[PDB]
Amino acid sequence: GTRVFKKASPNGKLTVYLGKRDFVDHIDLVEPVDGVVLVDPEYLKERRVYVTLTCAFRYGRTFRKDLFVANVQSFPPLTRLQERLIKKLGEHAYPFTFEIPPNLPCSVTLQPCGVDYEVKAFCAENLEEKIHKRNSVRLVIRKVQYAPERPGPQPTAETTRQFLMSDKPLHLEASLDKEIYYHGEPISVNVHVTNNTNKTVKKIKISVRQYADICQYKCPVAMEEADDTVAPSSTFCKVYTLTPFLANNREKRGLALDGKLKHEDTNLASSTLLREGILGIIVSYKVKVKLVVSRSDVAVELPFTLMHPKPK
């Protein structure tokens, strides 16, 4: 069976095809946008049919700086998708294989701005000829990342604050069950305080924060709060649970969400994988564990990855 997207210009004079609209990024390579444009030559007597891919950083200020632009001429001038579309359309169809290069930012929609990809196609007799709404056909497409196939190390981290007014410090350890969390799954913070000071642990505050680097933007997306006190010369151990989700995050204007075609509901933006070891929107999350003291601070942070699984 299989299905493919079509779109046309108001003139009904031009027709375009794609077989997907989410094109995956493997960090080591990015997939091609391999589509087929069907032409009506006679009405295309201008005789230069162009196809264009574009990565618009239409971020607010408002402005627009096109981070990446690609051009290809289809008429006058193959993957299996190309070949089957060409065979389906018979004769008067010509292809278009863009290859997005590595290192360009992911499809990101700031909560109403952001980065989105735009396949644009038209016919003319020169590239300098003016673009007009009567002739252009456009498709907004997405370029996204799935969670890694292999687990990393446990995101353990620690600290120790030798208070000057005390002989022995407040040793502390925080760890998550795993560094990868899928969307909708629960987080598990293992807080293992081992206090030896005269100060009293009043207030354990647990939060998951979004680090949107747009080329730093910080905002707490999940939050836990407890009066799990720790007594002087006493130890403590509790597994806190949290889960980031969009319900209580609507009002937070600006938070990065998964790229959207028109306006559909999408989850909080999956973490971006960096190439090996960058313009656009870079987003990452960390769990922050904060302990108030009194006799009023300590804290340790935990980088974790929040990303979708690869579809089945």
């Binding site: 069976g1 299989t2 299905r3 493919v4 997207f5 079509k6 779109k7 046309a8 210009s9 108001p10 077989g19 089957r84 579309l85 065979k87 389906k88 498709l139």
Partner: peptide, 9 residues
């Protein structure tokens, strides 16, 4: 305008 789906034949 709008986007439709079609077979691959």
């Amino acid at each position: 305008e709008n986007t439709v789906s079609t077979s691959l034949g």
